[model samples]
Every structure is written in C-alpha cells, then in structure tokens.
Target chain A: RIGELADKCGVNKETIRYYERLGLIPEPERMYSQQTVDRLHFIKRMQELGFTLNEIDKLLGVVDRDEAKCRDMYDFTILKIEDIQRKIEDLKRIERMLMDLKERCPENKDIYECPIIETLM
Target chain B: RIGELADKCNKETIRYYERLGLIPEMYSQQTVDRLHFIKRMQELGFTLNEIDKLLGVVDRDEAKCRDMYDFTILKIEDIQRKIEDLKRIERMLMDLKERCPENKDIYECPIIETLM
Candidate 1:
C-alpha cells in the first residue's frame, strides 16, 4: 500500500514513511486508510506547486519539501507568459522580414543577383 | 573589413565556421554575403549543419530559384509550429493565473484548486 500510495502521490515510499515519522501522516500501510492516504497525497501535490519543473529552456526547481507554497510560482508564471509572448513577437518580426524577401523572389529567377539576395538587398 | 564582418557574426563564431569548412578562406563582398546568409539562416531556425549544405548549394553558383525558395518555405513551416506551441503554453499559463485570485496568501491555497 505504501508503494502504491507513494506511486500515486509522486514521492518515494521512504518519503511517505519519513513524513509519517515526522508526524505529518499516519504510520505504515498496516496502520492507514483512505483518509490518511488522501492526506498524504495532498501534501505531495502541494509540493509540486513551487519550483520543480519545462523547456523552451531551463523551465524551473525547489527543495523545501516541508512547506507548500507559491506566490512566487504565480509571479514566474506571468513572467514566463510575458517572455513567451515577447519571443513570439520577436520571431514574428524576423519572419515578416524573411517573408518580404520571399515575396520579392520571382521564383523563376536567379541570375547575376541571385533573386533571393537581390530581393533582400 | 574582416573586423566589420567578424563583428556582425561574432569574431570567434565566424572563424569557427571557417574552421568547420563551411565557409571559404576568402574575405571580401562574397565572404560578407556568405556570412550574412549564415546569420539570417540561423535566426530563421536552420541548424548550422543544414545551413552548411544550403550555403554549399548557393556557393557552387548552380543554385536554382527553388533551392532558396524551398528552404525558406520549409523553415517558415517549422517556425509556425513553434509559434503554435508557444501560444499554447501561453494560454495554459494565462488560464492558471486567471483561475487563482490575487487576494489570497499561502494559507488559503488559491492556486491549488486550479492545479488539481
């Protein structure tokens, strides 16, 4: 049950036992029920909130497994969205630049000027 | 002229590209143009590896109109995919942020409900 419980909770059985020893949960599997399991699972889910995760690059981290938190998460979430949006704009700008050059291409010409470069220049 | 070209593409990187056998030993307007192509292609999402092949095709002077055309069109397709991915992420982030109200502190656990 501890193994299944830990698996469901996204933490190690060792951690679940430790949380039990630390008085954060009911004891070993033989001494627990749905409520104890639910409470334990709740704590693990809380831990997921702050730090700990992504990847357009270096997505996110955290170590304080005891206290669950995240106004910081909220702040970063907003900042990350802003960053993604800014990158979207920056890329769109360059895309338009390339598109303009693409547009100028006669698509049937590449003589002395090499239509692509000719168009860009 | 070397300094100017180097400055535009990073002094070390341009030399690195040279060392990789991607660009020629010559330095002049053609060299400048080649480097310009490299720089723009990089921003457009072509890997250095692909850029090398693309540049080689052009450098041979046997390049066709379709060569650059295909490369540009394909590159734009990939970029559009990435933009869609980023826009999706932006939506989810906005969704979560909006789900939680601004007035609550850690104890109230405003964001947790939405996360669950």
Candidate 2:
C-alpha cells in the first residue's frame, strides 16, 4: 500500500509519512491495504503545483462536503493565489529590511537600543 | 436578560451578541433563567486578560474533555503567546520595510523594452 501510494504521488515513502504526521493528509485505515492511486496522484500534483497544507485541507474539506458541486474548490484556489501574492510582497519587504540592516554597524550599540530588536521585542 | 450578561462581562449587549454570533461563547438553555454572575465574571475577566477567542475555544475544549486535569489550557496559553510573538516579528519586518521605502521615489522610468 505504501509503495503504491509512493509510486502514484511520485513522492518517497518518507515524505508521505511526514505529511501524514503533520496532519496534512488523512491517516490510512488499518484494514484498508490498497491505496487509491488516483487520489494520491491528485494530491501529489497539487503539492508539486505549490499548494499549501492549509489550502489542501480546505480542498479536502470541499471534496468531503460535496465533490459534485466543488464551488468551494474554486474559491480555495482563488484564495491560495491571493495568499501567495501577499506572502511574496511580505518577503520582498523583509528582504529590503535585511538589506538596510546590513548597512548599519553593530559596534557601540546600547543594550536597550537597536531598531530590529526594539521592533521585534 | 441581555442587560444582566452585559453587566457581568462588562461588555455592551451588542458586543456580547456579536461575540456569541462569532461562536466565541456557548448558547444557553431555552428556559434557564438568571445568568450566573460568577461564570460570566470568569469569562469576562479572561477576555479582559487579552486571551484570543481561539485560545478560549481550546480552553473550553480542555474543560469539556477533562475537568479534573486542565493540561490543554496551559498549552493553549503558550500557543497564544507564540502566535503573538510570530505576528510581532512579521509586523516589525513590515515596519522596517516601510521605513526603507520612504526614501524611494515611485516614478518608474523602466519597462520591458527599456530593460532590453
């Protein structure tokens, strides 16, 4: 079962187990020995496409609720795109901050001083 | 009545109703009269202590699962603190970004053709 899932997902057994442990995927049934290759492949494709675990969880929720309608699935994809855009902006801002911080000298700094520390603290 | 819970939580009636709507608090009985001042006081005091509504939800879960041993409550508080710390870091990074961007002029003189 593990080998089948691994082959379908194009992911190693370890990665699959890790995702399971992180509560990202459903725990397989003890009695169910055969894994669904299609399901595993779909999840793997989404992961390769850079979907987040939370986003995947919501997609799974939508599937569990209604696989026929899938209205929430479309909404989830839209939200995921927005989330990525926001994160990109945030990361760019952080990079700019780090670059500025690199220009400043650390010597003669007061214990109660430092903009980064003060801001973070 | 709404007036009694308001006085207990030290929150306006509207705020209490809004919180209730947000699934932050439990709905009471159809016939149960006289809201317990002590229970309402505890809830309000904790809210005033700056507990996140999510943290409070976990606390309620802990209380429901194990009234004798409230271990999950401590974890919930710790989780709340860590979430706050992470958010503080994110805010600081954004603030630093804002300060640096203040110096840059937004008039862009470049396009794909120019770059080429």
Candidate 3:
C-alpha cells in the first residue's frame, strides 16, 4: 500500500516513509487515500519551491490548527502566493546572471585576457 | 585589517573563512579585494568549495584561463537546471493560486483542499 502510495504521489517509497516519520504525511491506518496523495503532492510542490522540511512543518502546523479565519492565516496565505512569485523572478534573475557570466568567455584565452578570470582577481 | 575586513561582513564569517585558510589571517589590499570577489561569487550562487577551486586555479598562476571557464560554464548548467525546476513548481502553484484569490472567504481555506 505504501509503495502504491509512493507511485501515485510520484515519490519514492523511502521518501514517503520519511515524510510519515516527519508527520508531513499522515499514515493511512492501512489504505492510502486520495487526500493523502494530494497532501504529498502539495508537500513535494513546497519543497521544489525551496522550502526545507522544517519550514514546511511550520506551515502545515498553521493549517492543522484550524487557523484559517485568523489574521495570521489570512495574511500567511496571501504572503505565500507573493513569495512564490518573488522566488520565480529571483531565480530568473540568477539564471540571467549565470548566462551573462558564461558569455564573458574569450574562447580559451590566457588568464590575463579572460574576463571571467578578471572578476575573481 | 581583519577588523576592517569584518566590517565588510560579519566577524564570525571572516573568522570561519580564515579557518578555511582561503586567505591569510592578515589582509593585504589584494586579500581585501579577494574577499570582496568571494562575496560577489556567493551572490552568483557559488559554493565556497567551488570558489576555492577557482582561487586555486588563479593562485597557481596557470597558463589557461579556459580552465576556470569550464568551471563557470558548468555552474551555468547547474543554475539553469534549478531555474527550470523552480519554474515547473511555480507554474503549478500559480495555477492552484488562481482557484483561491485574495480577499476571499477562508471558511475552510479552499486552497489547501484545492491543492489536494
């Protein structure tokens, strides 16, 4: 059942088990539910967006506490969307910088003539 | 000069950098410049180990600038990969976020359920 869950969730069985250990994903008692699959999907999505397990744990904690109507929860949800958008733009900028850095190549010139080498010096 | 360098960054970071022996305990003008270079490289997503490799190549007075160029291009590939992966996740989140807009009722916070 756990293997089946992992397959459905597109994660390895080991990672599913690890998430269970960390309480990021709850045990199904015996059968893996659709809700559980989606929960793993959400968790995986957060991780890809650069959340550490500890940070995800803190987030899920807020959700688990039924804090939905509270000011913190309301503000938190808005902030998350903005934050994810910000991350996308920041990563795009980094990619641009890397490309620009790569473009400075002098086709294998001497260190003195290389712009890449010039930056580090 | 250590204190002067510390003013550029946290004292502990410089202390740890000194422990790594990337630079000497005393800072020459060149050393200060190298520290600034290291800071810039960190902003550009280089790990200290990778930066150390670059330094090693530079410090060895090697003939080929192409060697460090290889390292830089490889790092570009890594950054590109991360950018693509994050973009994938961002796409999904953006779609899901549409199903839950701002100034909406959080009666049960449909976003969490929608994510499910």
Best by TM-score: 3
For each candidate, the DockQ is: 0.19, 0.03, 0.26
Clashing pairs in 2: none
CA-lDDT, candidates in order: 0.59, 0.43, 0.65
DockQ of 1: 0.19
| lDDT, candidate 1, at B33 | 78
For candidate 1, lDDT tens digit of each residue in A6-112?
Answer: 67656887877776665556455535677767766555543432222122112212222322334345665666666667767766765675566466656625455
Off by over 4 Å in 1: A1-71, A108-121, B1-12, B20-45, B49-66, B103-116
Where model 2 places Cα greater than 4 Å from the true spot, the runs are A31-35, A66-121, B1-116
Model 1, B19-116: lDDT tens digits are 97677764588888778878866764568876775565556634433466656665666566666666776786777566566525555444433422
Which lDDT value does model 2 have at B73? 30
Residue lDDT tens for model 2, A38-120: 55565665554345566555555554664443443433333344444454444344344333433342421444333343233
* Highest DockQ scorer: 3
CA shift at A65, candidate 1, in angstroms? 15
List residue ranges in candidate 3 displaced over 4 A: A1-15, A29-45, A54-71, A77-94, A104-121, B7-12, B19-45, B54-70, B87-116
Give the docking tier of candidate 2: incorrect
User: Each candidate's TM vs. the true structure?
Assistant: 0.44, 0.28, 0.53
Residue range with the least summed lDDT across 10 consecutive positions in model 3 chain A: A66-75
Which candidate, 1 or 2, would have the higher DockQ against the true structure? 1
Query: TM-score of the candidate numbered 1?
Result: 0.44
**Candidate 2 lDDT, B1-116, residue by residue in tens:** 44544543345543554464422342454212223422332332234222233233334544323321122233334334433444553453344334443324354212332222
